[PDB]
Structure 1
Amino acid sequence: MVYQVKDKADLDGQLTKASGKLVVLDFFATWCGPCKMISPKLVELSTQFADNVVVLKVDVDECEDIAMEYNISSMPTFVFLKNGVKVEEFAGANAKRLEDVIKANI
């Protein structure tokens, strides 16, 4: 349910297919402790809101150009989009905050 983009083009297509659903972009790194710590929760929410949410993971070491483009500097950073418009964005592994956002903007 949680898809990890191959590159910008891949991201620019996943967002298209997404249509009018809440999109959650998880910018993370494999060396980031808090990122792993929240990955399970993201998965849970992912399936708990399948049909009305689409979670895309973006590895910063693999897609550095997408990291610069979105101006990320802290991991994990969650950018929430809906119909092509940033609905919100925050960094850190605050699991409750994460569920709050998905739920409130689903």
Structure 2
Amino acid sequence: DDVIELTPSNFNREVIQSDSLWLVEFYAPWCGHCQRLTPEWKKAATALKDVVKVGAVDADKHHSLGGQYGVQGFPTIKIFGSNKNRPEDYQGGRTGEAIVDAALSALRQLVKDRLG
């Protein structure tokens, strides 16, 4: 698939040091809504290929990464825009269509930030 697996080891290099818009899903493998989100997350990652980076963190395994970003419930989706130290929460529907729309909106902001 087109989803990037993120871990404590590669998160800084892949996300924090990136000029790209990133969407990151923090999940647990046992979580039902995480399981349901998986094929939709994949669909959004493929639609956004080479436009927005789409990653996932097993925040049950890497609970330190989850704790750093204040992950409570699963799945938690964070949008990392211009300032990679200030991710925002995506709390819209967990469908490819809703996710892509939020991604394109955040992408607009990222590009406006660059332009200005």
TM-score (norm: length of structure 1): 0.84
Which residue is equivalent to 1:35?
A: 34
Between 1 and 2, higher relative CO (CA 8 Å, sep ≥ 6) is seen in 1
Partner letter of residue 94 of structure 2? N
Which residue is equivalent to 1:90?
A: 90
Query: How far 1:8 moved relative to its partner?
Result: 1.9
Partner letter of residue 89 of structure 1? D
Which residue is equivalent to 1:14?
A: 14
Q: How many residues align?
A: 104
CA RMSD of aligned residues (A): 2.0
Relative distance call for 1:69 and 1:51 in structure 2 (3 A) is same
How do 1:38-49 residues align onto structure 2 when only pairs under 5 Å count?
38-49=37-48
Relative distance call for 1:31 and 1:75 in structure 2 (3 A) is same
Query: Does the 8 A contact of 1:32 with 1:75 survive in 2?
Result: yes
TM-score (norm: length of structure 2): 0.78
Higher strand share: 1
Q: Does 1:102 align with 2:103?
A: yes
Larger of the two Rg values belongs to structure: 2
2:9 is paired with a residue of what secondary structure?
A: helix
Give ranges in structure 1 of 5+ residues lacking alignment: none
Query: How far 1:91 moved relative to its partner?
Result: 4.8
Q: Does 1:55 align with 2:54?
A: yes
Q: Does 1:70 align with 2:39?
A: no
Partner letter of residue 34 of structure 2? C
Query: Does the 8 A contact of 2:40 with 2:94 survive in 1?
Result: no
Query: How far 1:26 moved relative to its partner?
Result: 0.4
User: How many Å separate the matches in 2 of 1:91 and 1:8?
Assistant: 24
